[PDB]
Design an enzyme around this catalytic site. Structure first.
Site, PDB file in Angstrom:
ATOM      1  N   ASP A 129       0.824  -1.207   0.000  1.00 41.02           N
ATOM      2  CA  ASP A 129       0.000   0.000   0.000  1.00 41.02           C
ATOM      3  C   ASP A 129       0.860   1.260   0.000  1.00 41.02           C
ATOM      4  O   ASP A 129       0.601   2.208   0.739  1.00 41.02           O
ATOM      5  CB  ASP A 129      -0.967   0.010   1.184  1.00 41.02           C
ATOM      6  CG  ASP A 129      -2.321  -0.555   0.833  1.00 41.02           C
ATOM      7  OD1 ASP A 129      -3.342   0.027   1.255  1.00 41.02           O
ATOM      8  OD2 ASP A 129      -2.361  -1.583   0.133  1.00 41.02           O
ATOM      9  N   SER A 130       1.896   1.267  -0.824  1.00 41.01           N
ATOM     10  CA  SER A 130       2.747   2.429  -1.025  1.00 41.01           C
ATOM     11  C   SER A 130       2.773   2.755  -2.513  1.00 41.01           C
ATOM     12  O   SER A 130       2.101   2.109  -3.318  1.00 41.01           O
ATOM     13  CB  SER A 130       4.150   2.187  -0.465  1.00 41.01           C
ATOM     14  OG  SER A 130       4.954   1.461  -1.372  1.00 41.01           O
TER      15      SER A 130
END
Ligand SMILES: [Mg+2]
Ligand SMILES: [Zn+2]
Ligand SMILES: [Zn+2]
Ligand SMILES: [Zn+2]
Lengths: 107, 187, 84, 97, 1390, 134
Positions: F4-5
């Site tokens: 989730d980057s």
RNA sequence: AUCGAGAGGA
DNA sequence: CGATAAGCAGACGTCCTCTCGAT
DNA sequence: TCTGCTTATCG
């Protein structure tokens, strides 16, 4: 050993310690219809003597206050009639060693 | 684009936020618990809303579970010692006779379930059959007036605090009893 | 208040906690530039000097392993086995 | 930064005893106190630089021992002492007999 | 230490509590207090002699303690005291003072009941001071006599002492009381008398319960600073010490003259009031506040309370120096145990390093660089208490570095730090990492170290912690390092696996179309750091040299690694590339997925960690990532919205599925609308409808989902992420393309929030799917408005369930940890605790650490007796059943040798004994079990590293194999004791492993299957022994904490069916719950007859409780005076049928429905006789026959009976009983599967009927005949503790905890759950994990402080005068010592 | 772009994509206890004035505060005032040791109770760095 | 600086 | 007057970053 | 949400 068929009064369980030796064991009948030690979850408890107990207490550096305790009301303590501090061996079967010795003192 | 609705106070624009509370002056029926003596409660929270917080919480409960046959119904009062039977409350008000009381509670004389449910309260109030004595239970001969004070200036103030209206409080308590019993019948 | 060097029951193998305490004490001794007891093949990190002396077993210390009844037994770092 | 008990659990499970004493004494509050070997409390007046130590209420002036504890622990023991509880601190587990 | 003294640094060993004798505090105190004014009228440096000045110290931080004269830092604060005249109560002891008066009559001054009474020997002789009190006080609670059974003593009466507010008076038979009287009768109370109450002759006497003079804390308990210099400053405590004193002045004013009726006690009441609230604010009575408003008060207790108090918050944890914190980001080109540390943070944290000849050069250079150049130093410390500040000092470059000096150098590259992620659930969340200083302000992590921290890179911030001595960085490097934690004790598996991009592209790389050219292969080869430099021969050469992904990937896998794994369809040729085969660190066939590299149990991480070591596996992480990342970089992978678009025919073909579901639901609805719904057993005619229609809709949803999943081509990116298990599940595909399905609130369909409708856009009483929360549309299709609202309801319930179960989970772990904490394997390999009480005698019952264990099978247990016969049989005395000379040098040289067949038949004998023994325990037939040494991985490590010829004979005789195996078992060691008990325990501890050992090291096995040789066989013996000795636990290992975590971390992932499942079940299991929400019985049938549904229905019909109330349509009372002629028009025939050859005339008629009389087979005669049997001769009872149309029962009693009949009816509807057991409520027959030995030896599964009940009265349920009372199971373990002893309760409790955990597809290794179950079980009966469950023990007062009740425990320990040995963790942690834990278990010396 | 980057285009960022202005408005006022003592805005002396902030006052004018346009970074004293006691004692107001920017402006105005009271707004442009949340 | 509340981030 | 069995009041559910008001 | 003082019911 006093097998009663239904139940007793509080005055009947007031004379269990009456005679100094030879203490009486009051058992119900609905309890003794089926053998509890015949259930799978109940292992084979084994009584032992003061000499075997002293061997336990010196070959483990143990005081009595350290054993995993059992109580005089315990059903399999009644089944074998445990007195004060009479120790039992317990052969438990498990997934790790398949055989394990437990030791229990009687509170 | 600024919308307003805030209060500038020492720089910061402080906001009043909306607050939520249960509505006052409405008939609610909640069963107390499973292991309780009271199996049903009729609550009404009462405030005048023009005056500020004459907080009066009236509880009209019911005793005994489904098995118990002693279905005595009592009710609580502000400033009272404890919960008193309902027939004593009605005799405190304008309604003395048993069965004229029933006309305030049961609205169809062919509803023998609800009627039969009410019988033990009459025996709870067998021992009282006039008005002067109904206030007398409430607690040294001024107590009656004290009781009437509680009946006028404290109990069920969401109708009024004038001595002239006691039929209104009576019919309304009968409506509360109707709701309570109608829930107890599982309807 | 004692035990013999014979009649010892504890594991002869060194526990990881004994190893860590020994290496830490030795690396402390070396950080305080106390006398070192091996030769270094270009090893200046004191913990690695402790580990070298461990693989040589020239660290003169003893572990006093305590027993719940107040008894104990001694195991010289020269004596224990190291397979960790 | 907080070193919570949820973190003390993990620093117990690994077995880092000296690291735990470090991060609970040297990397945080820590304090040296003088304890009477007879009283057992932080009563001893510690006027150092002359080796002058004495315990009021117990006449102790030779049997005194210094210790290292967190200042928070000194504070706790002091609050207990003001609450009439006496957590006596003794230097050896052996009683006289 | 900030100076030196002629005093030694002792350590705290034992702590004795007690009470302050006033006689003592008067002497200990340095000065009195005279008056309350904190400040001065002169307002000068002194404050005044009257309060907190005289020889107590002061605030100007220079040289201010009169007494200490050693400044503001070395002044502990020498207590003061008041000497108030009137003593009052100590609020902590109020209940105890009430109880102490109960045991002594006021004029006696001695105990009520002496040793003459024999109703004291059972109680006075406990000799366990504060446990005795609980019973002996109840003995003395109500005796009013105080004087042969009559000896010397007074005889006056004493009141039934009651308390109100803050004092106690009571009626003698009508009386008043006072406080000084209480103190008086305790000075007179004898010495030997209170000693049995739980007291001490010198440390705590009840005369000190009452306080004559309280002590005042020193100024270090009273800080005072202020923004304005020219004003006052005061701590909150001082305000009310001054309040207490002001009260002490009112009493002197009332002393100077007379005191009227109010002035008698009004002043003393309030004085004791302020002393009381000095210690406590909340007594559930008067609440009070300080002059400064805001309900503020000291409440010293509340200083120490749970949430953020002294004990739980300032001693169990501290704000600590040398700390860091920041956001995190994942960097593939970081190695695993490395951590990215920003340059500014490494420029801030300092490690003190001592000067020594090897570092002095670099240390000088570091000083030269200074604080703002990164490899520098903030300070330098000389050989004194003199600090040098490098950031601005004159001699910052003019340094002369003497030896032994300290340089606080900046944190350098490749150093040990402690990396933390909150919350620290388990010990894989606090791991030592190796520094790498990077820019950019964010902590950098390896990818595959997400899982043990449970951290995404969406902001989740992490902490870093820095050592300060050599010993602690050693402890981090050697105990807490990441490669050590790779394979984990919990779940006996590794926690770190290749994850998400590496893993997603590994499947893409290992496909059979994945081919790579030379130009790409070369860069991939140089990318792997630790590699030889040898180009692999291209698998395919022919028109173009190409490579397979398995080929170039096996360069990352070190040689010597072997791996077998089989799945559905995995032949030795895998046409779907299923399964995996690896030999010699090379991939032979398979597609690599989560099964092989995803932190699996039997996965390459668990293989490489054990075979090669931790370092090789930690490097393997990076070596795999650096290739697979790259290949993904240049191949690419995306995910669009066309990935959720399935075929026009497919998308339509699921809508017809929902349409047939709607037809089904409408038809069942129109059925139920006609009263034709024959509701089955134990369920409402409504519950039937709800359950059935929910089943219909869930089946339709699953069918549509698996009808879309079948249509996903092998290009669909969501399918390819699910395929590797990167981040994906089946239900994700179903809701996003087929149909989201049915939402649910509180485990039920959508609610009727509006009256008889669900939303005001629907009609009334609509029980249809759309009206009840079913969403015919999918996320791609688009939810309609009502559907969106219902989905929002369900989602909001999900959110609150998460936010609540997480809080409960954390509380669970807190209780668990604080209970099991300091369960640490001692040096005799015996699980113990502080006191020394044994929990386990052998840790995990085998003494084996959970890290090394591995799931391997035992071929003996399964399979036919004939297939067992083909193995292990050696009949030399037979031509056919002997070892062919093809397998041995002396094959035909020993044919028929008698002396060998002795040993060979002995070996077969113990093999058969073993098979029956193991089959006796593992009755399921399961052989895959956790065992401490992987033997097959030794056999392939010998078949490989000894180059076995698969055609030549071996060079060992039968003697060699057999006696070598028997001697190997003699040296597999766990315990080393010298006497019979310990030797038996060692045999027992290695029993199961010896069974496996002989299962795989048999003569026929070794010589036919393995084809071993002598040299390699002796190697295998040494190797098995060494791996075993490696697998045994280490003394000092704290498995109590680890077990609490190993239960707590899985409990965190248990988000959610006829029973209490999951986290509520665990909360009631741990709290041992006297009443539970789902009690039940699992009832097994006769041993001979288990498949006869007739007897199953019979037993069901003989156990289900049935009340006559459950069949009574109507109970009505009539007047019927003359029996021969009744009033009712359909009853006279029934009265005429009494002809076959006195009353009350009050009838009682009962009418019963015919449906429930047939749902449970019932006759009018049975019910009639049960009523007659109940009322034996006090009720005449008749009835109408079963053959009639209206079932009727009529009763009559045998003045004033208008009312005394109805109560008979009431007891006749409640306290009656038909055929059934008391507490049972329902029962269902279900056919379970059951593996059982077939006669020929094979384990075949048989079906058998089992009865599942609601409620439990097992005490007589098992006695019921026709059942198996050797198997019947009650989910309530609390009843099983009472019926079947305790050793069965331990087992049932473990079974329940297990099913809780393994209901989530989870697995915790048996050690930790068994340890928890034991620790609750050993203390007599069941012990809960609560403030009163386990913390009610006598472990240690400081140990008990750390858990809920804090000042209660402290007060009880001060009163009872406890003695803390300080042998547990929390004790040492309070005083900041090296707890005898892990590294501290053992002392070191010369 | 793991877990989730994400990755951001540095060429796009350097053009000003997702760029921010951040204004921290500091504040103070004197005469804490008026009619007995009175605090005074000024750039203090280093002699007999006691609690002198270890930071530099040399960016402060003689009225004891900065002008708009000055660059500020670290422990720069932004507002200076003293509290007299029986000479003056320091009551200056430094910057936040975490931030750095430029003085956007200054507002000087008396309170309802008539007393010198100042709002100093400091402004900083913030560029998308490598860990910023989006 | 101390207290106490509110607001967000994990 | 020695047991029993209802009451009716009792308690707690990791870190961390700001701001504010008023002692 | 479970417990540990009381309190009155029971023999
Ligand atoms: Mg996250
Ligand atoms: Zn002393
Ligand atoms: Zn001092
Ligand atoms: Zn007496």
């Amino acid at each position: 050993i006093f097998v009663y068929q239904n139940n007793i009064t509080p005055s009947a369980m007031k004379l269990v310690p009456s005679i100094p030796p030879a203490t009486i064991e009051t058992f119900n009948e609905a309890a003794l219809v089926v053998n509890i030690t015949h259930h799978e979850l109940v292992p084979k408890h084994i009584r032992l003597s003061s000499d075997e107990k002293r061997e336990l207490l010196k070959r483990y550096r143990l005081k009595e206050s350290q054993l995993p305790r059992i109580q005089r009301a315990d059903p399999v303590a009644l089944y074998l009639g445990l007195k004060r501090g009479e120790v039992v061996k317990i052969i438990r079967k498990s997934e790790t060693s398949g055989r394990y010795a437990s030791y229990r003192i009687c509170m | 684009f600024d919308m307003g609705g805030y209060f500038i106070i020492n720089g910061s624009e402080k906001v009043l936020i909306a607050q939520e509370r249960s509505a006052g002056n409405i008939v609610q029926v909640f069963k107390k618990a499973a292991p309780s003596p009271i199996s049903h409660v009729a609550e009404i929270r009462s405030a005048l809303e023009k005056g500020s917080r004459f907080i009066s919480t009236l509880q009209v409960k019911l005793y005994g579970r489904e098995g118990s046959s002693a279905r005595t119904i009592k009710a609580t009062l502000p400033y009272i010692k404890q919960d008193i039977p309902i027939v004593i409350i009605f005799r405190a008000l304008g309604i003395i006779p048993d069965g004229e009381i029933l006309e305030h509670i049961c609205y169809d004389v062919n509803d023998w379930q609800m009627l039969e449910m009410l019988k033990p309260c009459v025996e709870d109030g067998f021992v009282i059959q006039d008005r002067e004595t109904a206030l007398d239970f409430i607690g040294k001969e001024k107590r009656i007036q004290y009781a009437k004070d509680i009946l006028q200036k404290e109990f069920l103030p969401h109708i009024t605090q004038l001595e002239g209206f006691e039929s209104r409080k009576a019919f309304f308590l009968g409506y509360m009893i109707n709701r309570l019993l109608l829930c107890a019948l599982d309807r | 208040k004692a035990i013999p060097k014979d009649q010892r029951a504890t594991t002869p193998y060194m526990t990881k906690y004994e190893r860590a305490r020994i290496l830490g004490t030795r690396a402390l001794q070396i950080s305080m530039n106390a006398p070192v007891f091996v030769d270094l093949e270009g090893e200046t990190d004191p913990l690695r000097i402790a580990m070298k002396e461990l693989a040589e077993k020239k660290i003169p210390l003893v572990i006093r392993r305590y027993l719940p009844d107040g008894s104990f037994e001694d195991w010289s770092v020269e004596e224990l086995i190291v397979d960790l | 930064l907080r070193f919570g008990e949820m973190e003390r659990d993990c620093m117990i499970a690994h077995g880092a005893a000296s690291f735990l004493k470090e991060r609970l004494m040297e990397a945080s509050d820590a304090f040296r106190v003088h304890i009477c070997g007879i009283c057992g409390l932080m009563t001893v007046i510690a006027k150092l630089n002359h080796n002058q130590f004495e315990c009021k209420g117990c006449d102790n002036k030779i049997d005194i021992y210094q210790i290292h504890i967190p200042y928070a622990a000194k504070l706790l023991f002091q609050e207990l002492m003001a609450m009439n509880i006496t957590p006596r601190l003794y230097t050896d587990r052996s009683r006289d007999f | 230490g900030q100076q030196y003294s002629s005093a030694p640094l002792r350590t705290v060993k034992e702590v004795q509590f007690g009470l302050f004798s006033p006689e003592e505090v008067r002497a200990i105190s340095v000065a009195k207090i005279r008056f309350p004014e904190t400040m001065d009228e002169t307002q000068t440096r002194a404050k005044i002699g009257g309060l907190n000045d005289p020889r107590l110290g002061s605030i100007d931080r220079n040289l201010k303690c009169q007494t200490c004269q050693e400044g503001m830092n070395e002044c502990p604060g020498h207590f003061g005291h008041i000497d108030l005249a009137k003593p009052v109560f100590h609020v902590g002891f109020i209940a105890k003072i009430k109880k102490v008066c109960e045991c002594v009559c006021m004029h006696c001054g001695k105990l009520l009941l002496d040793e003459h009474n024999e109703l004291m020997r059972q109680a006075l002789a406990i000799k366990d001071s504060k446990k005795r009190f609980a019973a002996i006080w109840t003995l003395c609670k109500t005796k009013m006599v105080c004087e042969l059974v009559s000896r010397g003593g007074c005889g006056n009466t004493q009141p039934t002492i009651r308390k109100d507010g803050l004092k106690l008076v009571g009626s003698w038979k009508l009386r008043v009381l006072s406080t000084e009287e209480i103190l008086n009768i305790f000075k007179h109370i004898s010495v030997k008398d209170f000693t049995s109450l739980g007291f001490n002759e010198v440390f705590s006497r009840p005369e000190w319960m009452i306080l004559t003079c309280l002590p005042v804390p020193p100024p270090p308990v009273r800080p005072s600073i202020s923004f304005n210099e020219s004003q006052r400053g005061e701590d909150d405590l001082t305000f009310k010490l001054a309040d207490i004193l002001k009260a002490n002045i009112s009493l002197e004013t009332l002393e100077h003259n007379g005191a009227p009726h109010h002035a008698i006690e009004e002043a003393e009441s309030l004085l004791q009031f302020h002393v009381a609230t000095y210690m406590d604010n909340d007594i559930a009575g008067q609440p009070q506040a300080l002059q400064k408003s805001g309900r503020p008060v000291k409440s010293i207790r509340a200083r120490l309370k749970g949430k953020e108090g002294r004990i739980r918050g300032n001693l169990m944890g501290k704000r600590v120096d040398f700390s860091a914190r920041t956001v995190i980001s994942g960097d593939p080109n970081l190695e695993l145990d490395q951590v990215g540390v920003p340059k500014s943070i490494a420029k801030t944290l300092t490690y003190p390093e001592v000067v020594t000849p090897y570092n002095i050069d670099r240390l000088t250079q570091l000083v030269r660089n200074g604080p703002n150049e990164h490899p520098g130093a903030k300070y330098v410390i000389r050989d004194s208490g003199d600090r040098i500040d490098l950031r601005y000092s004159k001699r910052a470059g003019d340094i002369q570095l003497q030896y032994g000096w300290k340089v606080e150098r900046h944190i350098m590259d490749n150093d040990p730090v402690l990396f933390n992620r909150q919350p620290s659930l388990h010990k894989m969340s606090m791991m030592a990492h190796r520094v790498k200083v990077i820019p950019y302000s964010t902590f950098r992590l390896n990818l595959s170290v997400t899982s043990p921290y449970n951290a995404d890179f969406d902001g989740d911030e992490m902490n870093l912690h820095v050592p300060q001595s050599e010993e602690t960085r050693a402890e981090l490097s050697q105990l807490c390092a990441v490669p050590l934690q790779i394979v984990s004790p919990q779940s006996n598996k590794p926690c770190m696996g290749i994850v998400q991009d590496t893993l997603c592209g590994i499947r893409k790389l290992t496909l059979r179309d994945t081919f790579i050219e030379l130009d790409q292969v070369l860069n991939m080869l140089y990318w792997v750091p630790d590699w030889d430099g040898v180009i692999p021969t291209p698998a395919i050469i022919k028109p173009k040299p190409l490579w397979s992904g398995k080929q170039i990937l096996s360069v990352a896998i070190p040689n010597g690694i072997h791996l077998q794994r089989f799945d559905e369809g995995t032949t030795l040729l895998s046409p779907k590339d299923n399964g995996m085969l690896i030999i010699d660190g090379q991939i032979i066939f398979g597609v690599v997925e989560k099964k092989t590299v995803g932190s699996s149990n039997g996965g390459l991480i668990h293989v490489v960690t054990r075979e090669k070591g931790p370092q090789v596996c930690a490097k393997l992480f990076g070596n795999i990532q650096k290739v697979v990342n790259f290949w993904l970089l240049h191949n690419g992978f995306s995910t669009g919205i066309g990935d959720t678009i399935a075929d026009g025919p497919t998308m339509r073909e699921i809508t017809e599925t929902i349409a047939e579901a709607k037809k089904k639901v409408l038809d069942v609805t129109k059925e139920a609308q006609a009263n034709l719904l024959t509701a089955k057993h134990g369920m409402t005619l409504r519950e039937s409808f709800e359950d059935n229609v929910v089943r219909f809709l869930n089946e339709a949803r699953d069918k549509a989902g698996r009808l879309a999943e079948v249509n996903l081509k092998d290009l669909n990116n969501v399918k390819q992420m699910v395929m590797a298990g990167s981040k994906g599940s089946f239900i994700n595909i179903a809701q996003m393309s087929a149909c989201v399905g049915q939402q649910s609130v509180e485990g039920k369909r959508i609610a009727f929030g509006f009256v008889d409708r669900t939303l005001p856009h629907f009609s009334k009483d609509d029980y249809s799917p759309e009206s009840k929360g079913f969403v015919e549309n999918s996320y791609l299709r688009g939810l309609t408005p009502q559907e969106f609202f219902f989905h929002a309801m369900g989602g909001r319930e999900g959110l609150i369930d998460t936010a609540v179960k997480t809080a409960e989970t954390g509380y669970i772990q807190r209780r668990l940890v604080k209970a099991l904490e300091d369960i640490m394997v001692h040096y005799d390999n015996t699980t113990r605790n502080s006191l020394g009480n044994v929990i386990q005698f052998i840790y995990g019952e085998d003494g084996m650490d959970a890290a090394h264990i591995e799931k391997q099978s035992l071929d003996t247990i399964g399979g036919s007796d004939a297939a067992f016969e083909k193995r292990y049989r050696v009949d030399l005395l037979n031509t056919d059943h002997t070892l062919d000379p093809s397998l041995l040098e002396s094959g035909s040289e020993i044919l028929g040798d008698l002396k060998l067949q002795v040993l060979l038949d002995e070996e077969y004998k113990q093999l058969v004994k073993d098979r029956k023994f193991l089959r006796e325990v593992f009755v399921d037939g399961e052989a895959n079990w956790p065992l401490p040494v992987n033997i097959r991985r030794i056999i392939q490590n010998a078949q490989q590293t000894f180059h076995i010829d698969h055609t030549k004979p071996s060079d060992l005789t039968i003697k060699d194999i057999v006696l070598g195996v028997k001697d190997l078992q003699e040296n597999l060691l766990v315990l080393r004791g010298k006497n019979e008990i310990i030797q038996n325990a060692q045999r027992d501890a290695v029993t199961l492993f010896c069974c496996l050992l002989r299962s795989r090291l048999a003569t026929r096995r070794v010589l036919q299957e393995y084809r071993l040789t002598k040299q390699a066989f002796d190697w295998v013996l040494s190797n098995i022994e060494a791996q075993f000795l490696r697998s045994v636990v280490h003394p000092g290992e704290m498995v109590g904490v680890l077990a609490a975590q190993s239960i707590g971390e899985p409990a965190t992932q248990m988000t959610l069916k006829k029973v209490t499942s999951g986290v509520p079940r665990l909360k009631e299991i741990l709290n041992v719950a006297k009443n539970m929400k789902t009690p039940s019985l699992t009832v097994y049938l006769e041993p001979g007859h288990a498949a006869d549904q007739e007897q199953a229905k019979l037993i069901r019909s003989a156990i289900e409780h049935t009340t006559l109330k459950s069949v009574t349509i109507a109970s009505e009372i009539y007047y019927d005076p003359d029996p021969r002629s009744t009033v009712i028009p359909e009853d006279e025939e029934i009265i005429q049928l009494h002809f076959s050859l006195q009353q009350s005339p009050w009838l009682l008629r009962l009418e019963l429905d015919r449906a429930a009389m047939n749902d449970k087979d019932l006759t009018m005669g049975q019910v009639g006789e049960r009523i007659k049997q109940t009322f034996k001769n006090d009720l005449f009872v008749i009835w109408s026959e079963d053959n009639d149309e209206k079932l009727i029962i009529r009763c009559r009693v045998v003045a004033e009976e208008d009312h005394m009949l109805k109560k008979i009816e009431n007891t006749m509807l409640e306290n009656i009983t038909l055929r059934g057991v008391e507490n049972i409520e329902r029962v269902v027959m279900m056919k379970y599967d059951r593996k059982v030995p077939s006669p020929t030896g094979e384990y075949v599964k048989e079906p058998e009927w089992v009865l599942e009940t609601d409620g439990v009265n097992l005490s007589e349920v098992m006695t019921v005949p026709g059942i198996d009372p050797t198997r019947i199971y009650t989910n309530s373990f609390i009843d099983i503790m009472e019926v079947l002893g305790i050793e069965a309760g331990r087992a049932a409790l473990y079974k329940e905890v297990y099913n809780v955990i393994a209901s989530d597809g989870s697995y915790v290794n048996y050690r930790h759950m068994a340890l928890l179950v034991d620790v609750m079980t050993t203390q007599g009966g069941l012990t809960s994990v609560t403030r009163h469950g386990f913390n009610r023990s006598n472990t240690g007062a400081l140990m008990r402080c750390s858990f809920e009740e804090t000042v209660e425990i402290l007060f009880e320990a001060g009163a009872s005068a406890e003695l803390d040995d300080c042998r547990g963790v929390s004790e040492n942690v309070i005083l900041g010592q090296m707890a005898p834990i892990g590294t501290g278990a053992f002392d070191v010396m010369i | 772009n793991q877990e989730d980057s994400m990755i951001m285009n540095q060429s796009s960022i350097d053009r000003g994509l997702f760029r921010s202005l951040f204004f921290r408005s500091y504040m103070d006022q004197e005469k804490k206890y008026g009619m007995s003592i009175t605090e005074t805005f000024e750039k203090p002396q280093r002699t007999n004035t006691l609690r002198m902030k270890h930071g530099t006052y040399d960016k402060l004018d003689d009225d004891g505060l900065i002008a708009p346009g000055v660059r500020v970074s670290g422990e720069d004293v932004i507002i200076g005032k003293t509290t007299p006691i029986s000479s003056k004692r320091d009551a200056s107001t430094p910057l936040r040791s975490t931030e750095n920017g430029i003085v956007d402006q200054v507002l000087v105005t008396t309170n309802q109770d008539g007393l010198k009271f100042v709002k100093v707004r400091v402004r900083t442009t913030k560029i998308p760095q490598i860990g910023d949340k989006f």
